[PDB]
Write a protein that binds this ligand. Structure first.
Ligand SMILES: *[C@@H]1O[C@H](CO)[C@@H](O[C@@H]2O[C@H](CO)[C@@H](O[C@@H]3O[C@H](CO)[C@@H](O)[C@H](O)[C@@H]3O)[C@H](O)[C@H]2NC(C)=O)[C@H](O)[C@H]1NC(C)=O
Ligand SMILES: *[C@@H]1O[C@H](CO)[C@@H](O)[C@H](O)[C@H]1NC(C)=O
Lengths: 217, 76, 49
């Protein structure tokens, strides 16, 4: 189970009572296929976690055995988005990560502990040419952290333990985290260099109309 | 000929109150900027106002050194 | 975790039945469920003692 120490609930952000009465959210044609409308489930996901947009993020997970906390699970794992939200990134890349072969990515295929192959394993036979693609796996010997964008909304994430040598069980979970932070970025057609130039030209025209004002009197 | 009228524009009481109101509004918006709620609602207001203010200050500097090449640096 | 049962809430459910039969182990659901019936407004005397 993912830890959820300071849940968006109980703060001045979200209210679990309104969450119960079919709380719903929308997508502004930015995630995947469009205008996605998703109604939150409070029975399963409960009160979401809250993450300020900014600071690379990597979730904390506790492995429970026999109904009690067993330990903080430090094995490798991957994490994905259910709705198709794509406004997130990974801190490390293939070149900087401690990988001796091309790491796998969510793009090729679902993920599992069975089909996972370690990038740390020295294998040159197939990966002769390999670019600095993003690195997906979290935890383990890699210090990767997750980086969100400007959406400012609730993210529903599917976590699956990936290290096959950890346990035979396909340990996995679903959880919800609320990002707070990023604001509208519509700099658009107007830009700062183009804007002092635009405005000061509108200010010389004040002087260009000032010269006849001075010379006609 | 243009320099004389331009210094007369410098001394404009209208210009004095323009600068005073510009700076006061900038400080007020800065104060309102320390609240993410009001930073979110009316964000376009904040953006347009910040660019307006920077334009005003830079035009003031450029034209006030235009009226005077060297002695501008005399004033603290 | 949710709205715990109270005399007024149960009376609203079955008014004409006398008070002795209104509350019973047949219809008692704990608040601890968090997955039980609901999340009513918090802050209220607790009657189960
Ligand atoms: C996941 O990894 C695969 C490779 O196993 C990525 O696709 C492959 O990416 C490499 C490197 O970009 C491609 O090689 C060359 O890349 C350069 C980049 O500028 C490109 O200009 C060349 O034309 C050439 O593509 C390789 O062709 C490509 N192969 C395939 C089948 O896509 C994939 O992008 C990675 N995805 C993620 C999300 O990490
Ligand atoms: C809320 O979801 C339930 C699903 O159990 C559905 O029956 C109900 O019509 C929904 N109401 C609204 C307002 O979304």
């Amino acid at each position: 189970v993912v830890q959820n120490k300071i849940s968006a609930c109980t703060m001045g952000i979200l209210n679990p009572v309104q969450l119960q009465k079919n709380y719903t959210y929308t997508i502004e044609k930015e995630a995947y296929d469009d205008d996605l409308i998703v109604f939150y489930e409070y029975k399963d996901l409960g009160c979401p976690r809250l993450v300020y947009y900014d600071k690379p993020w990597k979730p904390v997970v506790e492995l429970w055995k026999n109904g009690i906390v067993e330990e903080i699970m430090n094995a490798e794992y991957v994490i994905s988005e259910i709705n198709g939200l794509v406004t997130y990134s990974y801190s490390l890349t293939a070149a900087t990560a401690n990988c001796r072969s091309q790491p796998q990515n969510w793009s090729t295929f679902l993920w599992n502990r069975e089909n996972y192959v370690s990038c740390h394993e020295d294998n040159k036979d197939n990966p002769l040419l390999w670019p600095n693609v993003e690195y997906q796996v979290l935890g383990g010997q890699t210090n990767n952290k997750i980086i969100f964008g400007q959406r400012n909304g609730i993210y529903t994430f599917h976590l699956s333990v990936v290290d096959p040598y950890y346990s035979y069980c396909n340990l996995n979970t679903i959880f919800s985290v609320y990002v707070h932070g990023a604001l509208p970025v519509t700099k658009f057609q107007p830009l700062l260099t183009i804007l002092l130039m635009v405005t000061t030209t509108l200010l010389t025209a004040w002087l260009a109309y000032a010269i006849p004002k001075q010379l006609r009197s | 000929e243009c320099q004389a009228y331009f210094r007369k524009v410098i001394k404009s009481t209208f210009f004095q109150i323009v600068m005073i109101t510009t700076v006061t509004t900038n400080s007020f918006l800065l104060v309102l900027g320390t609240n993410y709620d009001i930073q979110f609602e009316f964000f376009r207001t904040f953006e347009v106002s910040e660019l307006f203010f920077v334009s005003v200050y830079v035009c003031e500097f450029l034209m006030k050194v235009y009226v005077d090449p060297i002695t501008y640096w005399k004033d603290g | 975790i949710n709205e715990a049962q109270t005399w007024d809430s149960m009376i609203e459910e079955n008014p004409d039945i006398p008070l002795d039969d209104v509350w019973g182990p047949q219809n008692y659901r704990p608040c601890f469920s968090y997955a039980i019936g609901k999340p009513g407004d918090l802050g209220q005397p607790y009657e189960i003692l």
